[PDB]
Design an enzyme around this catalytic site. Structure first.
Site, PDB file in Angstrom:
ATOM      1  N   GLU A   9      37.367  37.994  49.164  1.00  0.00           N
ATOM      2  CA  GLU A   9      38.668  38.579  49.449  1.00  0.00           C
ATOM      3  C   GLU A   9      39.083  39.654  48.460  1.00  0.00           C
ATOM      4  O   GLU A   9      38.430  39.882  47.442  1.00  0.00           O
ATOM      5  CB  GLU A   9      39.750  37.490  49.482  1.00  0.00           C
ATOM      6  CG  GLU A   9      39.680  36.481  48.333  1.00  0.00           C
ATOM      7  CD  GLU A   9      39.632  37.134  46.965  1.00  0.00           C
ATOM      8  OE1 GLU A   9      40.617  37.783  46.566  1.00  0.00           O
ATOM      9  OE2 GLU A   9      38.600  37.002  46.277  1.00  0.00           O
ATOM     10  N   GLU A  35      36.374  38.891  45.313  1.00  0.00           N
ATOM     11  CA  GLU A  35      35.567  39.845  46.079  1.00  0.00           C
ATOM     12  C   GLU A  35      34.343  39.251  46.765  1.00  0.00           C
ATOM     13  O   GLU A  35      33.743  39.880  47.637  1.00  0.00           O
ATOM     14  CB  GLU A  35      35.094  40.975  45.173  1.00  0.00           C
ATOM     15  CG  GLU A  35      36.205  41.852  44.657  1.00  0.00           C
ATOM     16  CD  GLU A  35      35.693  42.972  43.790  1.00  0.00           C
ATOM     17  OE1 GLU A  35      34.494  43.320  43.917  1.00  0.00           O
ATOM     18  OE2 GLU A  35      36.489  43.511  42.994  1.00  0.00           O
TER      19      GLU A  35
HETATM   20  O1  LIG Z   1      37.912  34.248  43.022  1.00  0.00           O
HETATM   21  C1  LIG Z   1      38.623  33.749  41.995  1.00  0.00           C
HETATM   22  O2  LIG Z   1      38.438  32.640  41.511  1.00  0.00           O
HETATM   23  C2  LIG Z   1      39.661  34.794  41.569  1.00  0.00           C
HETATM   24  C3  LIG Z   1      40.407  34.200  40.464  1.00  0.00           C
HETATM   25  C4  LIG Z   1      41.419  35.055  39.944  1.00  0.00           C
HETATM   26  C5  LIG Z   1      41.739  36.345  40.383  1.00  0.00           C
HETATM   27  N1  LIG Z   1      40.934  36.817  41.484  1.00  0.00           N
HETATM   28  C6  LIG Z   1      41.155  38.218  42.070  1.00  0.00           C
HETATM   29  O3  LIG Z   1      42.357  38.750  41.590  1.00  0.00           O
HETATM   30  C7  LIG Z   1      43.330  38.885  42.674  1.00  0.00           C
HETATM   31  C8  LIG Z   1      44.269  37.725  42.632  1.00  0.00           C
HETATM   32  O4  LIG Z   1      44.892  37.713  41.339  1.00  0.00           O
HETATM   33  P1  LIG Z   1      46.463  37.858  41.260  1.00  0.00           P
HETATM   34  O5  LIG Z   1      46.908  37.798  39.843  1.00  0.00           O
HETATM   35  O6  LIG Z   1      46.891  39.300  41.896  1.00  0.00           O
HETATM   36  O7  LIG Z   1      47.101  36.733  42.030  1.00  0.00           O
HETATM   37  C9  LIG Z   1      42.550  39.024  43.967  1.00  0.00           C
HETATM   38  O8  LIG Z   1      42.449  40.388  44.452  1.00  0.00           O
HETATM   39  C10 LIG Z   1      41.190  38.342  43.614  1.00  0.00           C
HETATM   40  O9  LIG Z   1      40.124  39.180  44.155  1.00  0.00           O
HETATM   41  C11 LIG Z   1      39.918  36.075  42.076  1.00  0.00           C
HETATM   42  C1  LIG Z   2      40.416  46.274  39.862  1.00  0.00           C
HETATM   43  C2  LIG Z   2      40.627  44.907  40.440  1.00  0.00           C
HETATM   44  C3  LIG Z   2      39.684  44.326  41.235  1.00  0.00           C
HETATM   45  C4  LIG Z   2      39.909  43.107  41.733  1.00  0.00           C
HETATM   46  N1  LIG Z   2      38.933  42.481  42.582  1.00  0.00           N
HETATM   47  C5  LIG Z   2      41.092  42.432  41.441  1.00  0.00           C
HETATM   48  N2  LIG Z   2      41.320  41.116  41.973  1.00  0.00           N
HETATM   49  C6  LIG Z   2      42.017  42.996  40.673  1.00  0.00           C
HETATM   50  C7  LIG Z   2      41.805  44.233  40.159  1.00  0.00           C
HETATM   51  C8  LIG Z   2      42.837  44.875  39.271  1.00  0.00           C
END
Ligand SMILES: O=C(O)c1ccc[n+]([C@@H]2O[C@H](COP(=O)([O-])O)[C@@H](O)[C@H]2O)c1
Ligand SMILES: Cc1cc(N)c(N)cc1C
Ligand SMILES: O=C(O)c1ccc[n+]([C@@H]2O[C@H](COP(=O)([O-])O)[C@@H](O)[C@H]2O)c1
Ligand SMILES: Cc1cc(N)c(N)cc1C
EC number: 2.4.2.21
Lengths: 346, 346
Positions: free
Chosen positions: B171, B314
């Site tokens: 995602e 991602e």
């Molecule tokens: O896949 C995980 O465990 C994961 C853990 C923390 C953050 N992320 C990535 O960070 C984003 C979500 O973080 P946040 O702080 O905007 O809620 C989202 O675009 C994910 O791709 C992803």
């Molecule tokens: C650049 C970048 C990439 C991802 N995948 C996420 N979650 C957040 C930011 C800031």
């Protein structure tokens, strides 16, 4: 040998600093790639990699040898399996051969003490037809240990000339989890009961005998825990000595070495005891299902990347983790940068 | 949709039995390859793989979307980063793109609700420009959830026709760890404080606000934990719904799906709640550094293979584990057999 240990290079802090800065600017939240970033930086510090996380040719060195302690009834596999399996290694049908092929690495089968006739296609560095029964005396002399260390070290760093940048270490020897447990017990200070595992499917009923043998091996030999070579020669084995030699050779060559399972852990403890400068070059692969794995990894202060409950040996785990090392390099070299996308984070 | 869930095939116990028998006869101590053997058997049970552990083409589907709850100050990344990053996905410079390339997998970028103008090269399945702010109401209607599930499911199983046998889910959506935490809290019965993490580097001081938002989202929407679709539509998101749809589609297609991180866990909980028959097709990749990961994995009853402390999302972890899935197949097909070497073990 003193020259060898003396010339092990220290990590390049300058290269590591540039690496960290570059990783931090990659198209992602700082530190979000966790241990991949840490691994990338570690590689960058290794002089043999030329200031950058890279991977050229890959090789897995498998040290094969037999153990006299086998006669103490500590292993359920027939003794000839060592020789038979070493031969299969040349045919590419074994577990490490199949996994190495998947990783694009080459498997080097080295005989350091198999108790059988020489096997064609196998690198010959045989010290003797099996090592002494550690239950009643030493496995070998201190000189035989030092000589093999030197031999394997040179062989290893020589492969570097041919383009090898990443090493994997492995072994093959029926009953070798016994001397390995003895070594872990001595280096760690843990009781034999806490470190002795089932090895290659040893029946639960025969485990008590195995613990007794380990105790006896230690009581009779009185290995000096502050002397890694002393421990290896007394309660170790040819295959275990060889694995230690690979680690010293790669370190001297300033290159990374991927550990494998329980057997590699004991060899790593010995190596780090002999030369602390070796530690920075060691890279864990998986978490062995052998009982004494947690303790050995704790004293090595390492946290494996893979939890597969594997206990085959051969260097199969090392080969399975090579893609991970290459992934850290790919991340470092192929990812885009935040600045290029006009992305600004706090 | 009822037809879809109804036709999810059960695992092929017959194929699994033949697989186990074959693995047991391989050139190694029975069960010595641990979870690699278990994985191989699991794949064999998946009807889409034709009674054998195999891997043809590989694909990682990335569901992108924005969240209204972002306005509650729960994310430190600029909202536009979703659209910008989705675009980078088409250029192959992102983390999942680099890791997928290493695994030989193709990345499919799908827009299910990005709050910006359409991005060329991105599969368009946009439900709306971002989902509703779950803090004050539902993220979407039940119909919008069911429709997207259906759409993504068909897209997924359609890729199977083109030769894809292994799926990876991922995602992209700023602030999505908020609805993910809310979902985990509801499905698990755990308090918000136990599941809310720092997401993409959220300052420790702002964590309290994030917990409050999750509580509010639950109190106001009153999602029914026994209804996965109800939970997704109320406190979920378009991207989370999409991930669930990929899982249902692959399961219906009788194919394996590799989970990624924390976000995928919440989608997996929802999927297994909607259709338990999906569970057998789920394959864990790594252990997310997000706080609520342990709890989510416990209720899913899964043990990741990789411990990299990754938290990028991602689908980067999914891609990193694809080599592992291929290793189980290589082991199964390329290893030699004990009988052929005249090796007999107790
Ligand atoms: O896949 C995980 O465990 C994961 C853990 C923390 C953050 N992320 C990535 O960070 C984003 C979500 O973080 P946040 O702080 O905007 O809620 C989202 O675009 C994910 O791709 C992803
Ligand atoms: C650049 C970048 C990439 C991802 N995948 C996420 N979650 C957040 C930011 C800031
Ligand atoms: O690498 C491990 O963690 C490992 C754990 C248990 C057993 N082994 C393998 O099995 C052999 C040692 O088992 P054993 O019972 O003969 O002492 C040896 O040839 C190893 O390759 C290897
Ligand atoms: C019996 C046996 C034991 C080990 N350790 C290995 N590698 C292979 C086989 C066949």
């Amino acid at each position: 040998l003193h020259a060898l240990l003396r010339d092990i290079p220290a990590p390049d802090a300058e290269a590591m600093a540039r690496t960290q800065q570059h990783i931090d600017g990659l198209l992602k939240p700082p530190g979000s790639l966790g241990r991949l970033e840490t691994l990338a930086v570690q590689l960058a510090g290794m002089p043999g990699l030329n200031g950058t996380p890279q991977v050229g040719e890959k090789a897995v060195l498998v040290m094969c040898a037999d153990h006299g302690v086998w006669d103490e009834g500590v292993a359920v596999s027939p003794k000839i399996v060592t020789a038979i399996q070493a031969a299969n290694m040349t045919r590419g049908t074994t577990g490490v051969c199949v996994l190495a092929a998947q990783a694009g690495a080459k498997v080097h089968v080295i005989d350091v003490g198999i108790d059988a006739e020489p096997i064609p296609g196998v690198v010959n560095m045989r010290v003797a037809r099996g090592c002494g029964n550690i239950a009643v005396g030493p496995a070998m002399s201190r000189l035989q240990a030092e000589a093999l260390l030197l031999e394997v070290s040179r062989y290893t760093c020589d492969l570097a000339q041919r383009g090898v940048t990443l090493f994997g270490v492995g072994e093959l020897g029926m009953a070798n989890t016994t001397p390995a447990a003895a070594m872990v017990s001595v280096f760690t200070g843990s009781d034999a009961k806490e470190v002795v595992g089932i090895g290659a499917n040893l029946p639960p009923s025969r485990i008590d005998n195995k613990v007794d043998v380990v105790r006896r091996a230690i009581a009779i030999n009185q290995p000096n825990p502050r002397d890694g070579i002393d421990v290896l020669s007394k309660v170790g084995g040819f295959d275990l000595v060889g694995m230690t030699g690979v680690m010293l050779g790669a370190a001297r060559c300033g290159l990374p070495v991927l550990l494998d399972g329980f057997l590699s852990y004991s060899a790593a403890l010995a190596a780090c005891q002999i030369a602390p400068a070796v530690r920075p070059y060691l890279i864990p692969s998986h978490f062995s299902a052998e009982k004494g794995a947690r303790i050995a990894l704790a004293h090595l202060s390492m946290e494996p990347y893979l939890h597969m409950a594997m206990r085959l040996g051969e260097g199969s785990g090392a080969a399975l983790a090579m893609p991970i090392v290459e992934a850290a390099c790919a991340m470092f070299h192929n990812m885009g940068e935040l600045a290029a996308s006009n992305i600004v984070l706090p």
